Scaffold this active site. Structure first.
Site, short mmCIF file in Angstrom:
data_model
loop_
_atom_site.label_atom_id
_atom_site.label_comp_id
_atom_site.label_asym_id
_atom_site.label_seq_id
_atom_site.Cartn_x
_atom_site.Cartn_y
_atom_site.Cartn_z
N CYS A 158 137.47 -0.28 18.45
CA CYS A 158 136.50 -0.48 19.25
C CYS A 158 135.19 0.25 18.07
O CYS A 158 134.05 0.13 18.87
CB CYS A 158 136.31 -0.52 20.50
SG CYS A 158 137.53 -1.40 21.12
N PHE A 209 140.43 -7.50 26.71
CA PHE A 209 140.06 -8.16 25.46
C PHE A 209 139.79 -8.96 25.53
O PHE A 209 140.66 -10.14 25.80
CB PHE A 209 140.48 -7.31 24.04
CG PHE A 209 141.23 -5.98 24.02
CD1 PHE A 209 142.42 -5.06 24.12
CD2 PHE A 209 140.28 -5.19 23.68
CE1 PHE A 209 142.17 -4.13 24.02
CE2 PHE A 209 139.81 -4.14 23.74
CZ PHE A 209 141.27 -3.09 23.52
N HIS A 303 128.70 -0.35 23.15
CA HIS A 303 129.89 -0.76 22.86
C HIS A 303 130.91 -0.94 24.03
O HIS A 303 130.63 0.60 25.23
CB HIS A 303 131.24 -0.12 22.54
CG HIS A 303 132.70 -0.88 21.73
ND1 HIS A 303 132.91 -1.98 21.92
CD2 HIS A 303 133.63 -0.59 22.70
CE1 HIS A 303 133.74 -2.48 22.30
NE2 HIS A 303 134.79 -0.84 22.58
N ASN A 336 135.42 -7.30 25.84
CA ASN A 336 135.06 -6.48 25.31
C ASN A 336 136.38 -7.16 23.38
O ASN A 336 137.09 -7.36 23.92
CB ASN A 336 136.28 -5.16 25.54
CG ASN A 336 136.25 -4.05 24.47
OD1 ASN A 336 136.27 -4.40 23.32
ND2 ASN A 336 136.92 -3.36 24.57
C1 LIG Z 1 139.32 -1.90 34.97
C2 LIG Z 1 139.54 -0.17 34.32
C3 LIG Z 1 140.09 -1.20 33.21
C4 LIG Z 1 137.96 -0.27 35.72
O1 LIG Z 1 139.11 -0.53 37.29
P1 LIG Z 1 138.68 0.59 37.66
O2 LIG Z 1 137.08 0.63 38.56
O3 LIG Z 1 139.33 1.97 37.42
O4 LIG Z 1 139.74 -0.10 39.72
P2 LIG Z 1 140.80 1.25 40.11
O5 LIG Z 1 140.58 2.19 39.56
O6 LIG Z 1 141.04 0.61 41.31
O7 LIG Z 1 142.08 0.60 39.00
C5 LIG Z 1 142.58 -0.27 39.56
C6 LIG Z 1 143.90 -0.26 38.77
O8 LIG Z 1 143.56 0.06 36.95
C7 LIG Z 1 144.87 0.94 36.74
N1 LIG Z 1 144.37 2.23 35.65
C8 LIG Z 1 143.24 2.17 35.53
N2 LIG Z 1 142.88 2.66 33.38
C9 LIG Z 1 144.59 2.18 33.04
C10 LIG Z 1 145.18 3.14 32.08
N3 LIG Z 1 143.96 3.63 31.08
N4 LIG Z 1 146.70 3.04 31.95
C11 LIG Z 1 147.08 2.86 32.78
N5 LIG Z 1 146.28 1.86 34.14
C12 LIG Z 1 145.17 1.89 34.08
C13 LIG Z 1 145.45 1.99 37.97
O9 LIG Z 1 145.87 3.08 37.37
C14 LIG Z 1 144.47 1.35 39.13
O10 LIG Z 1 145.96 0.21 39.23
P3 LIG Z 1 146.38 1.15 40.77
O11 LIG Z 1 145.74 0.43 41.89
O12 LIG Z 1 147.63 1.33 40.96
O13 LIG Z 1 145.99 2.85 41.26
C15 LIG Z 1 138.95 0.85 34.26
O14 LIG Z 1 139.65 1.58 34.53
C16 LIG Z 1 137.66 0.19 33.11
O15 LIG Z 1 136.43 0.48 32.88
N6 LIG Z 1 138.33 1.51 32.61
C17 LIG Z 1 138.08 1.86 30.92
C18 LIG Z 1 138.69 1.12 29.50
C19 LIG Z 1 138.98 2.54 28.86
O16 LIG Z 1 140.17 2.68 28.85
N7 LIG Z 1 138.31 2.33 27.37
C20 LIG Z 1 138.70 0.82 26.50
C21 LIG Z 1 138.83 1.58 25.25
S1 LIG Z 1 138.67 0.83 24.10
O1 LIG Z 2 144.94 -2.59 20.61
C1 LIG Z 2 143.92 -3.59 19.75
C2 LIG Z 2 143.29 -4.22 20.17
C3 LIG Z 2 142.02 -4.76 19.26
C4 LIG Z 2 141.89 -5.71 19.48
C5 LIG Z 2 140.42 -6.40 20.58
C6 LIG Z 2 140.31 -7.53 21.05
C7 LIG Z 2 140.24 -8.31 20.07
C8 LIG Z 2 140.93 -8.65 18.70
C9 LIG Z 2 141.96 -7.46 18.61
O2 LIG Z 2 141.30 -4.01 19.85
C10 LIG Z 2 141.47 -2.20 19.65
C11 LIG Z 2 140.57 -1.42 19.74
C12 LIG Z 2 140.34 0.00 19.98
O3 LIG Z 2 140.01 0.54 20.14
C13 LIG Z 2 141.94 0.19 19.74
C14 LIG Z 2 143.03 -1.05 20.02
O4 LIG Z 2 144.57 -0.55 19.95
C15 LIG Z 2 142.91 -2.16 19.85
#
Ligand SMILES: CC(C)(COP(=O)(O)OP(=O)(O)OC[C@H]1O[C@@H](n2cnc3c(N)ncnc32)[C@H](O)[C@@H]1OP(=O)(O)O)[C@@H](O)C(=O)NCCC(=O)NCCS
Ligand SMILES: O=C1C[C@@H](c2ccccc2)Oc2cc(O)cc(O)c21
Ligand SMILES: CC(C)(COP(=O)(O)OP(=O)(O)OC[C@H]1O[C@@H](n2cnc3c(N)ncnc32)[C@H](O)[C@@H]1OP(=O)(O)O)[C@@H](O)C(=O)NCCC(=O)NCCS
Ligand SMILES: O=C1C[C@@H](c2ccccc2)Oc2cc(O)cc(O)c21
Lengths: 390, 390
Positions: A158, A209, A303, A336
């Site tokens: 990402c 995603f 992002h 995303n």
């Molecule tokens: C959508 C989630 C995705 C948003 O929801 P939220 O505001 O946290 O809502 P909640 O706190 O109710 O979480 C809901 C559930 O998500 C689960 N969850 C959130 N993040 C998690 C993770 N990284 N791994 C596993 N479970 C996860 C929680 O355990 C929770 O479960 P529960 O209801 O049984 O407790 C939010 O945490 C978010 O935006 N995360 C960011 C994404 C990220 O980590 N990075 C993106 C990277 S490229």
């Molecule tokens: O697991 C993959 C999924 C991939 C993707 C997203 C959208 C559409 C196609 C492919 O994007 C990622 C970004 C990361 O920073 C880490 C990851 O491990 C992933």
């Protein structure tokens, strides 16, 4: 008297095109769809958890290559941990360049110059690998000159939207007349899998995603009254955030691409971004001279890794509630899209600025930030300048 | 006034380090070893064809991560078409950056400056993919600054050595003070498989491919009497050769990395290279002014895809027989190390030039050519300048 002449002015975005698969999945319908098509409706606990992730995802819809028909034809994608890489690859090795070609044609058409003026190409994806690569397949699909200087950025993640700009800035600035085609193309057939109550970070990826490709023409010294600049690249930075070892991992396994995501990603990003930005703006606006604009006076192309990332960054930095609006629009409508996302947001922002007759391509502000976050935990920071309108 | 200052002089190689696995495999011994450890000695006709390829490979020895003990421990590497990607990946995701670290440390020691002056990293490999990538694993192993600007070029193939130079040139020249660590690290555990009479192009890979890593420090404007330049990058070109569609393919499959090699690869390269070099040299030395040096007054850093490539290029271009000597010495003692190979050759050339007291780092010639050949069929051309000696 260089053997390769360089360019003078700042690398400039001269065109942006985007493209999505036509199959739209509305988030309201996705838990029923996703748990039915993976024959997991009996795991009612898991599903309720997925419902609340989707409920809070701030994604309204996404465009997905995978249809119900493709999934029911390929049962190994619907299970959670079945061997499936070869099938996933056979799909995305074709469809990633093809989706990128749609986006590139729209960028070339807007730009207005024949495709043979394209001298460099950067192709970025997280979806599959091959030799020759997606960059080669794209050049073939478009009919680019045989001597285009290519570069394929595989397995980025990402932060890749920031990475492609960091590299394109130097290709365009150090090569006079260079015109860099920049493509980010992402297709989720590489990661899609069934749900499991032991891999709840993968469930998050299924909520957020989506698919898309975006394309830029990047070049220095636009020909006046012929080429049009929309943003300028002025300063780039890359950081590995502290205490983030293993915050975001992705492995290409025989079951396809596996996704591993720690719950402290939003805290790690939001608690460190401010120092990164404050240092970036000090470099760009040194005293020896105007101080940096305030955060509220910059345009923001962030992002949207997830709503919690945006919310916690917005909170930690004290951003007025409208600063992430273009960012949040793209997440709402496409989810995303990994590395492509920031360029959809860039295109969304300039288009709104034209539509609402703001004073610049950057919502009426002069300077702005494009940020990408991904495995590392890696933070890419690009300081952008908008271009005045009419 | 640029927000990022650029550099003035040509991107220069300031140090080179190399690293090979300790296990040496003498080509005299290899047919017996390979057919024995892959339980194929009953394949009498296959093996004799393989003996002939080895007899002719102009490879005397190769360094290999894989040992008999490792192979006997992991039987899915010794079969020809067994699921094995996860095992291979688990190996090279670690061993590729580890081998790249030995070469990097050697290059850094030679260079003499603290590792924190490294601003940029380019990591190139054809062996394995991961997120975070080998670039991140290398920076971790070395302890580079958290803000190193990284790039990982995955699944490049044998042209990667040219590609890293093409990119490092712009990173070095467009960023004042930038010092670019360039690493190419290649480990054949990703492709190694048993023999089969239906896949004889893969047999060719078993005769020619070795393991190795090489590392460069690249930077513009070396500090006088402090840093030392060995080669300058002045002109870069990339080309897809005509009628070469499918000449060199590689796919990352669940049985690991697979290799497809058409028998006309040497004809394709040797019949088109002259026009490519003539064009390049015309660009570097235009009339409007000296003429381009003759091929025999250039120094030659040529990727030795195999002896038949070298021989047919030498024949087509009318090269004096000593021109490919440094190139052929590396193929003899190391095999085809894919993207790392041209940098071993470059290291070999400068070391010989110094040892024998020629007048320049390029065997006494001022200008030279680095060529890489790989999937595409992609040709990378880098016009180099040497540096005078004492
Ligand atoms: C959508 C989630 C995705 C948003 O929801 P939220 O505001 O946290 O809502 P909640 O706190 O109710 O979480 C809901 C559930 O998500 C689960 N969850 C959130 N993040 C998690 C993770 N990284 N791994 C596993 N479970 C996860 C929680 O355990 C929770 O479960 P529960 O209801 O049984 O407790 C939010 O945490 C978010 O935006 N995360 C960011 C994404 C990220 O980590 N990075 C993106 C990277 S490229
Ligand atoms: O697991 C993959 C999924 C991939 C993707 C997203 C959208 C559409 C196609 C492919 O994007 C990622 C970004 C990361 O920073 C880490 C990851 O491990 C992933
Ligand atoms: C070592 C080979 C590798 C050199 O051998 P050579 O001098 O051509 O010797 P020969 O012509 O007797 O070939 C020996 C055997 O190799 C076989 N062979 C050579 N290239 C082959 C290929 N690409 N696929 C399948 N078989 C091949 C020949 O058919 C021959 O088999 P035979 O003895 O049963 O007839 C040579 O063809 C070469 O150097 N080629 C370049 C390898 C290459 O493509 N590298 C660029 C790379 S990615
Ligand atoms: O099959 C792979 C092997 C890889 C390699 C070589 C040596 C050491 C490690 C890895 O190099 C290649 C180069 C190509 O141009 C095409 C390929 O298909 C391959």
């Amino acid at each position: 008297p260089r053997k390769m002449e360089r360019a003078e002015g700042p690398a400039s975005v001269l065109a942006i095109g985007t493209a999505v698969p036509p199959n739209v999945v509305y988030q309201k319908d996705y838990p029923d769809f996703y748990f039915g098509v993976t024959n997991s409706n009996h795991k009612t606990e898991l599903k309720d958890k997925f419902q609340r992730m989707c409920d809070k995802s701030c994604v309204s819809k996404r465009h997905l290559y995978l249809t119900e028909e493709i999934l029911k034809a390929n049962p190994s994608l619907c299970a959670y941990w079945e061997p499936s890489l070869d099938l996933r690859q056979d799909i995305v090795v074709v469809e990633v360049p093809k989706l990128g070609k749609q986006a590139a044609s729209a960028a070339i058409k807007e730009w207005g110059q024949p495709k043979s003026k394209i001298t460099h190409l950067i192709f970025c994806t997280t979806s599959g690998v091959d030799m020759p690569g997606a960059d080669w397949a794209l050049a073939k699909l478009l009919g680019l000159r045989s001597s285009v200087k290519r570069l394929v950025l595989y397995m980025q993640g990402c932060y890749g939207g920031g990475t492609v700009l960091r590299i394109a800035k130097d290709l365009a600035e150090n090569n006079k007349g260079a015109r860099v085609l920049v493509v980010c193309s992402e297709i989720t057939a590489i990661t899609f899998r069934g749900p499991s109550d032991t891999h709840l970070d993968s469930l998050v990826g299924q909520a957020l995603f989506g698919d898309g490709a975006s394309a830029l023409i990047v070049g220095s010294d636009p020909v006046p009254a012929v080429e049009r600049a929309w943003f300028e690249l002025h300063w780039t930075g890359s950081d590995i955030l502290p205490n983030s070892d293993g915050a975001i991992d992705g492995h290409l396994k025989e079951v396809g691409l596996t996704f591993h995501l720690m719950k402290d990603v939003p805290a790690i990003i939001s608690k460190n971004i401010g120092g990164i930005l404050k240092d970036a703006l000090a470099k760009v606006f040194p005293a020896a001279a105007p101080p940096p604009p305030t955060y509220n006076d910059l345009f923001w192309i962030t992002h949207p890794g997830g709503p919690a990332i945006l919310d916690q960054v917005e909170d930690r930095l004290g951003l007025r509630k409208d600063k992430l609006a273009s960012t949040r629009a793209v997440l709402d409508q496409f989810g995303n899209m990994s590395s492509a996302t920031v360029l959809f947001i860039m295109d969304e922002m300039r288009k709104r600025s034209v539509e609402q007759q703001l004073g610049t391509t950057g919502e009426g502000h002069e300077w702005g930030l494009l940020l990408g976050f991904g495995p590392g935990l890696t933070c890419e920071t690009v300081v952008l300048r908008s271009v005045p309108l009419v």
